């Protein structure tokens, strides 16, 4: 936590000049019924419509969890949201759209069904360690 | 041939004739079927119509009323009407409801589950007794406890002694603990449930006892039954670390298995076979003589016994005349019967890489040498002498 | 008190076995391999090291071959740390016997003495057993050349050719097909290298990862000279016998 | 007030005498009944118990075996329960002054 | 890895294509085939390949309980996988000990991913009436063979053990060419000289030299993957691998 | 010091370290003792699974304590030497101070008394060895044959066997050994002890060792040839 | 060949036509009865379908307003009036009530509790292992009878003195001593409703659900008239409390604490006797043990020599045995043994007689059996380890 993941994405929202759809990871959990599946279906269509377009989920971690009880109602409703995301991630192919870009400060809890190939492909690293050169560079801009 | 066809021909046209007589002369009499019969079937169908809503009988009140739960939320104080056995409706049972005004119009439902199918083996193993080369004495401690009281329940009832209950087949690896279970499961033709001891550790908390209570309930319903528990050693020794209840969880499950095995229930006929390789680990409460009655023990096949084992695996095989069975026995000195099976399988595989149907003497000598190196002696009895 | 923290390394198991001595056997099966062959006219001791990087100076290094006097060498397989302790108690008992009888120690005495030291720790004391196994090659006029192996039980028996360390089983089966009684010291060398060449974990067999020492009667006047080979005699004898 | 001591000295007995003699409102509560398996249904019960105690004021809430709302000392990264925790911290906010703690006395045993 | 294709063809492909050769000899069916080696040397890639040639279903189970939503659980599943496997057979059940995600299951059990392997192997030695000839083989992958407990190395339990060495300088050249066929080239490039210069250790690494060369093509807006791009790529891939691996 | 009470009573009334000690003697190789008219014969199992093992220099199962007392053993080979050292010591100590060699019954009483001591000394585990002490008293020709065990109790026997498969050998000796009439001579007795062993060794002329001890300090070991001859005769006799 | 190959097809059509006659007589669709009392039941169900005894939507009361506040299951709350069927005296707090399908009005009070579906499954049908089978005439049998049997049988004698009878018994001893055997014996005798719960089944999946189960069990008992609840094998749920600091016994002792609190209440609890049977008292918490929740400890211990003589007589009396069996001789030869080894003794005596082809068991056969049982299984004796936890 706290290396400038989001702040690098802010910069990218300015420069692109392509539509940009910004959703928290908690907009997808609804309280009524089937509405989780209904949020995903809308969000991907809306990108394709005004293509080319970037989708950003600030934190996707709670939706992309690794373990499910599958007895409690709450879990059974997240499984549906997570199946839809995976299904429409392969449908995104052969559009001008660049796929969902998403961040998480946790890496052990991710569902590895997202990190299979053909879905999420490129993994960026942000280090905690700072060498002496790279530290002076950060001090320079704030000061 | 002649007489079996001849008597069947007479029985199956005499059956024809009696069914025609009952049908014609119970349709012209209105007190039996006739007038009631052609109106009840059409009415019963028509009145309740469809859709029939499935629900679950939550509980039954003794007065021909019940409280049933629709999956759609509303509960109902229903009545129990025509064409249902009222003793068959119990908590958990699924019922069919009349959708206009909620009343149980019956249960027609088998309610087949993947919980009964997972325990059940449709076994047809090609193994029969006397695919066990020698160790004849051990075979005839197992058959006296499990198989024989199903064949002749007369002997134990004349004598006045209760049949022995339970067995544990333990010893060195490779002495055929699993192979004996398969011989005795084939003959009895009782319901043979199989469950490996590893499965009783699962991740969630308190699920261990629910799983263990379920297995014995399927068995007691299906008497006479066998419950083979393969490598019950596995729960004591290992620590999969998926179950976050830790060691405390494994102990509470074990205690559940002890109660289901004898305890208070007073179950039906359930023999148990418990296979293990290390009886030390097993909790002393389980092995205790009262739940099990006879502790069969095995040992490493002898040099005379190994001739019998070899004769079984070399019979199926095709050979040249150049082979000598006797030089393959003597070289190995105290090697189990699992290794003898692999020695035959390895040789036939070398001959199939060379692509000749015959398994010659050389394929046997290369296979035997490779199998002695793969093994790992025994630094238990090396310590000794 | 002290009882809570106590391992008890001397009790029997429920089946009449000693767990802790069994386990000492297990840690000896990871260490490097050592082989000895008995010819008519000498003994070959040949051991493979567990280290092999090039920074390490394996040339002056000896961690497998030790002389106990001027007629009995041993090879080691196990904890090299532990083994130096028993070797000084042996060196001293070998010499006491020369002091009191003015006659070189029989091989049978010096082997039987070390065994009982090891036995000693599993009988009483509560100390963990020793984690070592020796091959003794020695010469005495009573039986000629003799070979003996002892393990952490303390049981020792003689041998014609034996091997302790990794894949004890595999090394014994290769030797068993080839060994013959009319062997000379030249023939034995060639069987020793070849057998280590077939078991070594790495396909390549180098002169630097092998230690090697013989005892030959070709020293004049009916005597025996122990030589632990230099790294330049090993190198030449690996090209001679055609292993590389 | 808190009552602590060996089992059998009569901590529960003494509270029973107090209930019959003072003719104040006596709200019996047991600490394991409070804990509930639903997510956050156990927290809703604490606030409802003190809210009822305002109407009937003045009141005594006698809690038995506070070991079911145990101790907060866990922080593991593998499980940790963190259910008993939540309803215990809801109980502390009603013991605080925001909620009137001058009409409501608490007997803990 | 040309030798390895021929060894697993023996035990997997042939008893499906010809159940008669195995009846005639009197040889028992082969069951388990254990694959072990350093990651990236392609033990999975060979698995997918054999399944496609024989024409059998490939059922990958990772040990995860999340993807199971139709049964619901992978908690009491052993035979419940086989029920689905028997409908779609011939089958190849695949199980891999990942030992970097789910590393706490491996502990204290010779693999908490080996609970899956042994329990499923136990039902497979004797089931139904597929004793004449079986239509489900079972394949286990482990980074190292060290972890597997002795009750999976006994004689007669498996039938074949494949080992995968890290690729030699000869092998790297072949493997680097299969990935280069997908993208542009330039005359005169010696794909052999880049394999030697790359010390490497994996075929995963080798594939990363091709993708990284395509990254250097974008920044300069080249029209073709040229000889300069590979020299820069080799470096970027090797330096990133040595900082994480040491 | 180190003095933990390793050996204690269980509530069933057996010491568990002593029952464990006696199970250890069961896995041991087999040694048989039979006393004829005026000899004893000690037959022992050589583990012949081993190959490339020299028999010239390898310690045997029969170790002479004195020049007329021999001792055989089953159990842990390593621990056995510890009894035999204290025994060779005790035999010369008794010659020194009272004069006259030890009588077989006294040499047992010492050896049996050591195994008993190590079942009370705190810090010591019991011995894993049972012995057959045989021989002739000095100036007499009554054969004597004793058995000790890790309980420390000792008894004389007409025939006995310790070690693995002992029930099968003992059953054969209860039928083939008449208590009234011993094997007539020294030659018949050897033929009774070999014939008992060949049931559980499942033959191998090299496997069997026979040591005969006769009155007046005559200890001889029957050579391989002799053993082979006897085996062939019995096999041929029994075969016929 | 042909005369029978063609007539084998003919008889297969004539049987398929005989299936149509048998289907038509009884119908066999929507049948679940003997189709004889269901004709009359058919006319009775037409009168119930016209009457609105049903449907009655099942709800529950949340607050009585001197008027009621009802909650439906489909979650929507209503203020209702009163039915002409019932007095307002019978409508209580939290109670389940049925309300009209239409304009919601309270009709009939219902018996409470929706949890009954695990704890209802353990209301026992009372097996019979008669009291003769219990070994000897031990004191241990007579100390159980003073707790369970006597206050239900004869409350005349307790009324005079003024003693209120004890309630708790703790049966504890090494495995195989007949802790359970007595439980089954008092199960039929007693005649009060008998509810046995295994100590493992109180452990549930969710934090706080194990406390519910045991809480409703008692509520049901108080309704019934005179109960005995037999907690079997409560090693699980019983372990003294610790806090590892890392996970604690948090989920186990949540249950254990609920049980303690209903055996002293803040009220007198109903007529409820409680029997605990464990293989270790070591495990149990000091809060369970002291009098008022476990009044009388009774030890079932290994029987002495005379005990082992009476327990041989109780297994053997069905057996055919000769007249010359001196049961004193083989009881003397059997060392310190549990009653569970003595069953296996007699079974093995009968076993060697069936192998030998003899109908009557002899003296030789009983000695062999004693030899086989004690020799081998002295290696596997449960008795030695478990006697030490005692
Ligand atoms: N006594 C025997 N006679 C003939 N064949 C045998 C014998 N014992 C083992 N085999 C052969 O070895 C195969 C494997 O044996 P099995 O699975 O019974 O070994 P096991 O002792 O049960 O191993 P584990 O210790 O894993 O339980 C059998 O299918 C059989 O063909
Ligand atoms: N006192 C006794 N008299 C007669 N038979 C007995 C006696 N005790 C035990 N038995 C026999 O032993 C069998 C097993 O006993 P039981 O099931 O009561 O064990 P337990 O005392 O509950 O011990 P555990 O619960 O540890 O198994 C009984 O079914 C009965 O046949
Ligand atoms: N020898 C090879 N030939 C071709 N491709 C290879 C080779 N080795 C590795 N690869 C590439 O690396 C990828 C990762 O290897 P994988 O098949 O997942 O098995 P593992 O990761 O267990 O070694 C392969 O899918 C393939 O694209
Ligand atoms: Mg952020
Ligand atoms: Mg098996
Ligand atoms: Mg209190
Ligand atoms: Mg892989
Ligand atoms: Mg019991």
- Each residue of C70-92: b (16+ CB within 10 Å) or e? ebbbbbbbbbeebbeebbeebee
Which own/partner pairs from F142-146 qualify as long-range (CB within 8 Å, at least 24 positions apart)?
Answer: F143/F35, F143/F36, F143/F38, F143/F39, F143/F40, F144/F35, F144/F40, F144/F104, F144/F105, F145/F33, F145/F35, F145/F40, F146/F104, F146/F105, F146/F108
Q: What are phi and psi of G51, to 5 degrees?
A: -80, 150
Shortest CA gap F114–chain B (Å):
22
Assigned token pair, A112: 């590895």
Give dist(CA C179, CA E65) in Å, integer: 58
Those chains having 3 or more beta-carbon pairs within 8 angstroms of chain E are: A, B
User: Which residue is it, tokens 């190849």?
Assistant: E92
Give dist(CA B281, CA B239) in Å, integer: 14
Q: Are A120 and A57 in contact (CB under 8 A)?
A: no
Closest CA relative to residue G130, chosen from G186, G185, G194: G185
Q: Cα angle at F183 between F182 and F187, to 5 degrees? A: 150
Give dist(CA B150, CA B144) in Å, integer: 10
Instruction: Name the binding residues of B for ATP.
Output: 171-178
Closest CA relative to residue F141, chosen from F68, F204, F190, F78: F68
Which residues, at least 6 apart from B37, have a Cβ–Cβ distance to it below 8 Å? G25, G27
Which residues, at least 6 apart from G80, have a Cβ–Cβ distance to it below 8 Å? G67, G68, G70, G99, G104, G105, G106
Q: Where are the domains of chain C?
A: 1-244
- Please, which residues bridge with residue A19 across strands? A53
User: Which residue is it, tokens 């699992």?
Assistant: B338
Is D9 annotated as a binding-site member?
A: yes
Which own/partner pairs from E116-122 qualify as long-range (CB within 8 Å, at least 24 positions apart)?
Answer: E116/E61, E116/E63, E116/E78, E117/E152, E118/B198, E118/E151, E118/E152, E119/B196, E119/B198, E119/B199, E119/E78, E120/E78, E120/E81, E120/E82, E120/E93, E120/E95, E121/E31, E121/E32, E121/E152, E121/E157, E122/B196, E122/B230
Q: Which domain holds residue F216?
A: 1-240
- Ordered DSSP codes for B159-172: HT-PPP--EEEESS
Contacts of C162 in chain F (CB under 8 A): 52
CB–CB contact F2 C13 (8 Å): no
Is E151 a pocket residue for ligand 1 (Cβ < 6 Å)?
Answer: yes
Cβ-based interface (< 8 Å): residues of C facing F = 3, 6, 8, 10-17, 38, 108, 112, 115-116, 118-119, 122-126, 143, 146-148, 153-162, 172, 175-176, 179
Contacts of B88 in chain G (CB under 8 A): 32
User: Which residue is it, tokens 């970037």?
Assistant: A54
Cβ-based interface (< 8 Å): residues of B facing F = 302-304, 333-334, 381, 384-385
Is E201 a pocket residue for ligand 3 (Cβ < 6 Å)?
Answer: no
Give dist(CA D22, CA D19) in Å, integer: 6
Touching check for G362 and chain F: CB below 8 Å? no
In angstroms, the Cα distances linking B208 to A56, A68, B236, D80 are 43, 18, 14, 20
Burial group, residue G130, by CB count within 10 angstroms (0-12, 13-18, 19+): exposed
Give dist(CA B129, CA F9) in Å, integer: 46
User: Which residue is it, tokens 């102990």?
Assistant: B251
Touching check for F20 and chain G: CB below 8 Å? no
Assigned token pair, F228: 């082979």
Q: Euclidean distance between the first and final Cα of chain B, in Å? A: 68
Q: Are G319 and G350 in contact (CB under 8 A)?
A: yes
Is G179 a pocket residue for ligand 2 (Cβ < 6 Å)?
Answer: yes
Q: What is the distance, to the nearest Å, from the Cα of residue F82 to the centroid of all Cα atoms in its chain?
A: 15
User: Which residue is it, tokens 């190395």?
Assistant: E153
Which residues, at least 6 apart from G326, have a Cβ–Cβ distance to it below 8 Å? G363
Give dist(CA B193, CA B199) in Å, integer: 14
CB–CB contact E66 A83 (8 Å): no
Tell me, in angstroms, the distance from the centre of ligand 6 to residue D11's CA: 5
Q: Are C115 and C125 in contact (CB under 8 A)?
A: no
Contacts of E67 in chain A (CB under 8 A): 113
Residue A137's Cβ-side half-sphere holds a number of Cα atoms within 13 Å equal to 5
Give dist(CA A65, CA G133) in Å, integer: 59
User: Which residue is it, tokens 């060994």?
Assistant: C179
Domain at F145, CATH number: 3.60.20.10
Q: Cα angle at A50 between A48 and A55, to 5 degrees? A: 60
- Ordered DSSP codes for A30-94: -SSSSHHHHHHHHHHHHHHHT-SEEEEES--TTTTBS---SSSHHHHHHHHHHHHHHHHHHHTTT
Those chains having 3 or more beta-carbon pairs within 8 angstroms of chain F are: B, C, G
Assigned token pair, E141: 């992958």
Query: CA gyration radius for chain D?
Result: 15
Contacts of A111 in chain E (CB under 8 A): 66
Give dist(CA D90, CA D49) in Å, integer: 12
Q: What is the dihedral of CA B273, B279, B283, B286, to 10 degrees?
A: 30
Give dist(CA F56, CA C142) in Å, integer: 11
- Each residue of E218-242: b (16+ CB within 10 Å) or e? eeeebeebbeebbeebbeebbeebe
In angstroms, the Cα distances linking E96 to B108, B193, E61, E117, E136 are 45, 29, 8, 9, 17
In eight-state DSSP terms, residue G149 is H
Which residues, at least 6 apart from C80, have a Cβ–Cβ distance to it below 8 Å? C63
Which residues, at least 6 apart from G384, have a Cβ–Cβ distance to it below 8 Å? F10, F11, F12, F16
CB–CB contact B377 C26 (8 Å): no
Residue B211's Cβ-side half-sphere holds a number of Cα atoms within 13 Å equal to 24
Number of structural domains in chain F: 1
- Ordered DSSP codes for B182-228: HHHHHHH-SEEEEEEGGGG--SSSSHHHHHHHHHHHHHHHT-SEEEE
- Please, which residues bridge with residue E137 across strands? E92
Handedness of CA E175, E177, E178, E180 (dihedral sign): positive
Give dist(CA C12, CA F16) in Å, integer: 9
Assigned token pair, F95: 């010659």
SS3 per residue for chain E: CHHHHHHHHHHHHHHHHCHHHHHHHCCCCCCEEEEECCCCCCHHHHHHHHHHHHCCEEEECCCCCCCCCCCCCCCCCCHHHHHHHHHCCCEEEEEEECCCCCHHHHCCCCCCCHHHHHHHHHHHHCCCCCCCCCCEEEEEEECCCCCCCHHHCCCCCEEEEEECCCCCHHHHHHHHHHHHCCCCCCCCCCHHHHHHHCCCCCHHHHHHHHHHHHHHHHHCCCCCCCHHHHHHHHHHHHHHHHHHHC
CB–CB contact F28 B381 (8 Å): no
Give dist(CA A75, CA B204) in Å, integer: 15
Give dist(CA G33, CA G23) in Å, integer: 15
Closest CA relative to residue C190, chosen from C205, C207, C178, C177: C178
Q: Are C135 and C149 in contact (CB under 8 A)?
A: yes
Which residues, at least 6 apart from F128, have a Cβ–Cβ distance to it below 8 Å? C12, C16, F21, F24, F25, F75, F76, F79, F150
Give the nearest ligand 3 atom to E37 CA: 23
Give the nearest ligand 1 atom to B135 CA: 1
**Chains F and D touch, contact meaning at least 3 pairs of CB atoms under 8 angstroms apart:** no
Q: Which helix (H) or strand (E) holds B285?
A: helix B284-287
Touching check for G94 and chain F: CB below 8 Å? no
Q: Are strands B53-61 and A101-102 parallel, antiparallel or unpaired?
A: unpaired
SS3 of C45, please? strand
Cβ-based interface (< 8 Å): residues of D facing G = 7-8, 12, 15-16, 19, 28, 30-33, 35-37, 42, 62, 64-65, 67-68, 70-71, 73-74, 76, 79-81, 83-84
Burial group, residue C25, by CB count within 10 angstroms (0-12, 13-18, 19+): buried
Crossing angle for the helix pair G363-377 and G339-355, nearest 10 degrees? 130
Q: Are G130 and G305 in contact (CB under 8 A)?
A: no
Contacts of B385 in chain F (CB under 8 A): 28-29, 47, 77
Give dist(CA A29, CA A36) in Å, integer: 6
Q: Are F197 and F176 in contact (CB under 8 A)?
A: no
In angstroms, the Cα distances linking E177 to E3, E171, E216, E221, E227 are 18, 10, 19, 23, 15
Assigned token pair, G126: 């009372």
Contacts of A70 in chain E (CB under 8 A): 65, 68-69, 72-73
Nearest CA in chain C to B380: C22
CB–CB contact A70 E73 (8 Å): yes
User: Which residue is it, tokens 């307790």?
Assistant: G158
In eight-state DSSP terms, residue G88 is G
Q: What is the distance, to the nearest Å, from the Cα of residue G12 to the centroid of all Cα atoms in its chain?
A: 53
- Ordered DSSP codes for chain F: --------B-TTSSBHHHHHHHHHHHSSPPEEEEE-SS-EEEEEE---S--S--SSSS--S-EESSSSEEEEEEE-HHHHHHHHHHHHHHHHHHHHHT-SPPPHHHHHHHHHHHHHHTTTSTTBPPP-EEEEEEEE-TT---EEEEEE-TT--EEE-SEEEESTTHHHHHHHHHHH--SSS--SSHHHHHHHHHHHHTTTS---TTTEEEEEEETTTEEEE--HHHHHHHHHHHHHHHH-
User: Which residue is it, tokens 């048998």?
Assistant: G22
Q: Are G201 and B209 in contact (CB under 8 A)?
A: yes
Is E207 a pocket residue for ligand 3 (Cβ < 6 Å)?
Answer: yes
Give dist(CA G318, CA D32) in Å, integer: 52
CB–CB contact C119 F57 (8 Å): no
Q: What is the dihedral of CA F55, F59, F63, F67, to 10 degrees?
A: 70
Q: Are A8 and A125 in contact (CB under 8 A)?
A: no
In angstroms, the Cα distances linking B2 to A107, B95, E26, G346 are 79, 52, 40, 54
Q: What is the distance, to the nearest Å, from the Cα of residue G173 to the centroid of all Cα atoms in its chain?
A: 21
Q: What is the dihedral of CA G289, G290, G296, G299, to 10 degrees?
A: 40
Q: Say how many C-beta atoms besides its own lie within 10 A of residue C127's C-beta.
A: 12
Q: Say how many C-beta atoms besides its own lie within 10 A of residue C6's C-beta.
A: 11
**Residue B100 backbone class (left: φ over 0; alpha: ψ -120 to 50; beta: rest):** alpha
Give dist(CA F222, CA F210) in Å, integer: 6
Query: CA gyration radius for chain C?
Result: 19
Give dist(CA B308, CA E31) in Å, integer: 26
**Chains A and F touch, contact meaning at least 3 pairs of CB atoms under 8 angstroms apart:** no
Q: Resolution of this PDB entry, in A?
A: 4.1
Q: Are E56 and E17 in contact (CB under 8 A)?
A: no
Is D87 annotated as a binding-site member?
A: no
Instruction: List helix spans (H) across chain C.
Output: 19-28, 80-101, 107-123, 168-178, 185-199, 231-240
Give dist(CA F69, CA F135) in Å, integer: 5
Closest CA relative to residue B48, chosen from B92, B82, B87: B82
Q: Are B177 and B170 in contact (CB under 8 A)?
A: yes
Give the nearest ligand 2 atom to G134 CA: 3
Closest CA relative to residue B83, chosen from G45, G47, G55: G45
Nearest CA in chain C to B375: C169
Give dist(CA E106, CA F71) in Å, integer: 53
- One of 3.30.70.20, 3.60.20.10, 3.40.50.20, 3.40.50.300 is the CATH number of C1-244, namely 3.60.20.10
Experimentally determined by: cryo-EM
Crossing angle for the helix pair G7-26 and B2-24, nearest 10 degrees? 30
Which residues, at least 6 apart from B164, have a Cβ–Cβ distance to it below 8 Å? B144, B145, B293, B294, G347, G348, G351
In angstroms, the Cα distances linking F185 to F42, F181, F214, F238 are 15, 11, 11, 20
Q: Are D20 and D55 in contact (CB under 8 A)?
A: no
In angstroms, the Cα distances linking B207 to B264, F111, F123 are 21, 59, 46
Q: Say how many C-beta atoms besides its own lie within 10 A of residue A132's C-beta.
A: 6
Q: Euclidean distance between the first and final Cα of chain F, in Å? A: 65
Is D97 annotated as a binding-site member?
A: no
Query: CA gyration radius for chain B?
Result: 30
In eight-state DSSP terms, residue C130 is P
- Please, which residues bridge with residue A127 across strands? none
Q: Which helix (H) or strand (E) holds A101?
A: strand A101-102
């Amino acid at each position: 936590p706290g290396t400038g993941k989001t702040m690098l994405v802010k910069a990218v929202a300015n420069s692109t000049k392509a539509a940009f759809i910004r959703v928290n990871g908690s907009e997808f959990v609804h309280k009524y019924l089937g509405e989780g599946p209904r949020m995903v279906r809308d969000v991907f269509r809306l990108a394709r419509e005004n293509a080319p377009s970037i989708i950003f989920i600030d934190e996707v971690d709670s939706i992309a969890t690794k373990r499910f009880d599958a007895q409690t109602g709450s879990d059974r409703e997240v499984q549906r949201i997570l199946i839809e995301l995976l299904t429409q991630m392969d449908g995104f192919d052969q559009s001008t759209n660049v796929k969902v870009i998403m961040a998480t400060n946790r890496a052990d809890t991710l569902d590895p069904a997202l990190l299979r190939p053909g879905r999420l492909d490129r993994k960026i690293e942000f280090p905690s360690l700072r060498d002496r050169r790279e530290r002076r560079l950060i001090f320079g801009t704030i000061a | 041939t002649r007489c079996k066809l001849k008597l069947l021909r007479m029985e199956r046209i005499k059956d024809h004739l009696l069914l025609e007589e009952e049908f014609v002369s119970n349709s012209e009499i209105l007190k039996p079927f006739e007038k009631k019969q052609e109106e009840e079937k059409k009415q019963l169908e028509e009145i309740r119509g469809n859709p029939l809503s499935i629900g679950t009988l939550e509980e039954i009140i003794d007065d021909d009323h019940a409280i049933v739960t629709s999956p759609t939320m509303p509960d109902y104080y229903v009545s129990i009407l025509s064409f249902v056995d009222k003793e068959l409706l119990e908590p958990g049972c699924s019922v069919l409801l009349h959708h206009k005004t909620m009343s149980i119009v019956g249960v027609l439902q088998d309610d087949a589950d993947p919980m009964v199918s997972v325990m059940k083996m449709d076994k047809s193993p090609t193994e029969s007794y006397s695919d066990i080369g020698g160790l004849e004495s051990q075979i005839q401690e197992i058959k006296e406890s499990v198989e024989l009281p199903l064949t002749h329940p007369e002997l134990y009832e004349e004598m006045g002694i209760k049949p022995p209950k339970g067995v544990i087949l333990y010893g060195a690896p490779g002495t055929g603990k699993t192979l004996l279970a398969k011989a005795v499961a084939n003959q009895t033709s009782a319901t043979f449930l199989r469950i490996v001891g590893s499965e009783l550790i699962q991740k969630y908390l308190g699920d261990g006892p629910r799983l263990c209570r379920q297995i014995f309930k399927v068995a007691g319903e299906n008497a006479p039954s066998i419950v083979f528990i393969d490598e019950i050693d596995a729960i004591g020794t290992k620590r999969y670390d998926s179950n976050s209840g830790g060691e405390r969880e494994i102990q509470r499950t074990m205690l559940e298995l002890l109660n289901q095995l004898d305890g208070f229930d007073d179950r039906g006929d359930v023999k148990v076979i418990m296979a293990t390789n290390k009886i030390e680990t097993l909790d002393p409460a389980l092995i205790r003589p009262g739940r099990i009655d006879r502790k069969i023990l095995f040992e490493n096949p002898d040099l005379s016994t190994k001739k019998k084992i070899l004769g079984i695996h070399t019979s199926k095989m095709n050979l040249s005349e150049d082979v000598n069975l006797e030089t393959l026995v003597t070289t190995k000195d105290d090697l189990s019967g699992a290794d003898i099976q692999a020695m035959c399988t390895e040789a036939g595989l070398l001959a199939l890489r060379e692509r000749r149907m015959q398994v010659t003497a050389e394929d046997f000598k290369q296979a035997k040498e490779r199998v002695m190196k793969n093994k790992v002696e025994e630094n238990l009895e090396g310590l000794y002498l | 008190g002290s009882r809570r923290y106590d391992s008890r390394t001397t009790i029997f198991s429920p089946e009449g076995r000693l767990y802790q001595v069994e386990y000492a056997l297990e840690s000896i099966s990871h260490a490097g391999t050592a082989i000895g062959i008995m010819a008519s006219d000498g003994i070959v001791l040949a051991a493979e090291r567990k280290v092999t990087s090039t920074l390490l100076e394996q040339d002056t290094s000896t961690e497998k071959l030790y002389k106990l006097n001027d007629k009995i060498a041993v090879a080691v397989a196990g904890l090299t740390a532990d083994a130096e302790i028993l070797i000084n108690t042996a060196r001293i008992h070998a010499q006491n016997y020369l002091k009191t009888y003015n006659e070189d120690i029989p091989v049978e005495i010096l082997v039987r003495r070390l065994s009982d030291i090891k036995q000693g720790y599993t009988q009483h004391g509560g100390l963990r057993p020793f984690g070592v196994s020796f091959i003794y090659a020695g010469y005495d006029d009573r039986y000629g050349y003799q070979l003996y192996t002892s393990n952490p039980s303390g049981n020792y028996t003689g041998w014609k050719a034996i091997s302790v360390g990794a894949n004890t089983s595999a090394a014994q089966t290769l030797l068993q097909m080839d060994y013959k009684d009319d062997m000379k010291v030249d023939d034995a060398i060639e069987l020793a290298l070849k057998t280590l060449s077939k078991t070594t974990d790495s396909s390549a067999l180098t002169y630097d990862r092998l230690e090697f020492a013989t005892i030959r009667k070709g020293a004049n006047d009916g005597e025996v000279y122990q030589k632990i080979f230099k790294p330049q005699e090993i190198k030449d004898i690996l090209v001679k016998t055609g292993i590389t | 007030a808190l009552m602590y001591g060996p089992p059998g000295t009569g901590k529960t007995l003494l509270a029973r005498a107090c209930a019959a003699q003072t003719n104040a409102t006596f709200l019996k509560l047991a600490a394991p009944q409070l804990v509930q398996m639903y997510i956050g249904e156990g927290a809703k019960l604490v606030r409802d118990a003190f809210a009822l105690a305002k109407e009937k004021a003045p009141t005594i809430i006698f809690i038995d075996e506070l070991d079911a709302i145990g101790t907060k000392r866990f922080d593991s990264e593998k499980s940790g329960d963190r259910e008993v925790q939540r309803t215990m911290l809801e109980l502390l906010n009603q013991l605080d002054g925001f909620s009137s703690d001058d009409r409501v006395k608490v007997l803990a045993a | 890895l040309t030798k390895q294709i021929k060894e697993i063809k023996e035990v997997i492909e042939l008893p499906v294509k010809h159940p008669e050769l195995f009846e005639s000899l009197g040889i028992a069916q082969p069951k388990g085939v254990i694959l072990y080696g350093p990651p990236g040397t392609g033990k999975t890639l060979l698995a997918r390949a054999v399944a496609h040639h024989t024409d059998c279903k490939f059922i990958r189970v990772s040990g995860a309980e999340l993807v199971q939503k139709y049964i619901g659980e992978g908690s009491r599943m052993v035979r419940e996988l086989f029920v689905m496997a028997r409908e779609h057979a011939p089958s190849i059940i695949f199980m891999d000990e990942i030992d970097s995600i789910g590393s706490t299951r491996v502990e204290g059990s010779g693999g908490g991913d080996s609970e899956v392997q042994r329990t499923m192997l136990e039902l497979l030695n004797q089931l139904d009436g597929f004793e004449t000839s079986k239509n489900i083989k079972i394949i286990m992958a482990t980074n190292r063979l060290d972890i597997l407990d002795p009750a999976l190395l006994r004689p007669g339990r498996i039938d074949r053990k494949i080992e995968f060495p890290p690729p030699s300088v000869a092998a790297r050249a072949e493997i680097l060419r299969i990935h280069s066929r997908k993208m542009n080239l330039t005359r005169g490039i010696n794909l052999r000289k880049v394999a030697e210069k790359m010390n490497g250790c994996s075929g995963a690494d080798v594939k990363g030299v091709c993708t990284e060369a395509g990254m250097y093509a974008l920044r300069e807006r080249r029209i073709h993957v040229t000889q300069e791009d590979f020299e820069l790529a080799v470096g970027k891939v090797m330096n990133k691998n040595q900082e994480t691996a040491i | 010091g180190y003095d933990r009470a390793l050996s204690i009573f269980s509530p069933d009334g057996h010491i568990f370290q002593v029952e464990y000690a006696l199970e250890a003697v069961k896995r041991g190789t087999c040694a048989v003792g039979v006393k004829g008219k005026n000899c004893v014969v000690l037959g022992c199992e050589r583990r012949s699974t081993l190959k490339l093992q020299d028999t010239r220099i390898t310690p045997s199962k029969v170790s002479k304590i004195d020049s007329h007392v021999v001792l055989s053993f089953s159990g842990l080979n390593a621990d056995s030497r510890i009894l035999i050292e204290k025994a060779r010591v005790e035999a010369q100590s008794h010659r020194l101070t009272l004069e006259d060699p030890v009588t077989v019954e006294y040499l047992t009483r010492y050896v049996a008394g050591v195994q008993q001591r190590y079942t009370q000394s705190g810090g010591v585990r019991p011995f894993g060895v049972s012995t057959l002490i045989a021989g002739f008293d000095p100036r007499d020709d009554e054969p004597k044959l004793y058995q000790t065990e890790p309980s420390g109790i000792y008894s004389s026997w007409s025939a006995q066997t310790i070690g693995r498969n002992s029930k099968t050998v003992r059953e054969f000796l209860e039928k083939n050994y008449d208590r009234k009439e011993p094997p007539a001579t020294v030659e018949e007795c050897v033929k009774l002890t070999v014939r008992s062993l060949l049931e559980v060794v499942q033959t191998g002329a090299k496997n069997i060792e026979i040591t005969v001890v006769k009155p007046d300090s005559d200890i001889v070991a029957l050579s391989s040839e002799e053993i082979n001859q006897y085996v062939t005769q019995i096999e041929q006799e029994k075969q016929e | 060949a042909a005369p029978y190959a063609a007539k084998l097809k003919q008889t297969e059509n004539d049987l398929k036509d005989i299936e149509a006659r048998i289907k038509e007589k009884a119908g066999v669709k929507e049948s679940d009865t003997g189709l004889a009392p269901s004709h009359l039941w058919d006319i009775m169900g037409d009168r119930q379908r016209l009457g609105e005894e049903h449907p009655l939507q099942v709800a529950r009361c949340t607050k009585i307003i001197k008027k009621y506040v009802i909650n439906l299951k489909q979650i929507a709350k209503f203020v209702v009036g009163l039915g002409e069927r019932v007095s307002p005296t019978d409508i209580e707090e939290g109670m389940r009530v049925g309300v009209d399908r239409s304009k919601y009005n309270i009709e009939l009070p219902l018996p409470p509790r929706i949890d009954p579906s695990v704890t209802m499954m353990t209301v026992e049908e009372k097996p019979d292992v008669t009291y003769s089978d219990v070994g000897g005439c031990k004191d241990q049998i007579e100390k159980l009878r003073e707790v369970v049997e006597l206050p239900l049988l004869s409350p005349e004698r307790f009324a005079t003195l003024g003693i209120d009878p004890p309630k708790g018994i703790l049966l504890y001893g090494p495995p195989g001593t007949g802790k359970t055997l007595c439980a089954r014996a008092v199960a039929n005798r007693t005649d009060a409703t008998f509810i046995r719960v295994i100590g493992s089944e109180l452990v549930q999946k969710y934090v706080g659900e194990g406390a519910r189960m045991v809480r409703e069990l008692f509520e049901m008992a108080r309704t019934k008239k005179a109960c005995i609840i037999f907690f079997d094998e409560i090693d699980a749920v019983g372990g003294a409390r610790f806090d590892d600091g890392a996970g604690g016994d948090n989920e186990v002792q949540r249950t254990m604490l609920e049980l303690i609190t209903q055996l002293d209440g803040f009220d007198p609890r109903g007529n409820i006797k409680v029997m605990f049977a464990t293989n270790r008292p070591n495990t149990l918490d000091p809060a369970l043990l002291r009098p008022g929740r476990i009044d009388r400890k009774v030890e079932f211990s290994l029987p002495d020599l005379e005990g082992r003589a009476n327990i041989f007589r109780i297994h053997s009396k069905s057996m055919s045995v000769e007249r010359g069996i001196r049961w004193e001789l083989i009881s003397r030869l059997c060392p310190n043994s549990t009653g569970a080894e003595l069953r296996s003794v007699c079974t093995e005596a009968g076993m060697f007689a069936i192998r030998a082809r003899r109908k009557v068991a002899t003296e030789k056969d009983f000695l062999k059996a004693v030899d086989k049982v004690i020799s081998g299984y002295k290696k596997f004796s449960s008795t030695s380890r478990y006697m030490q936890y005692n």
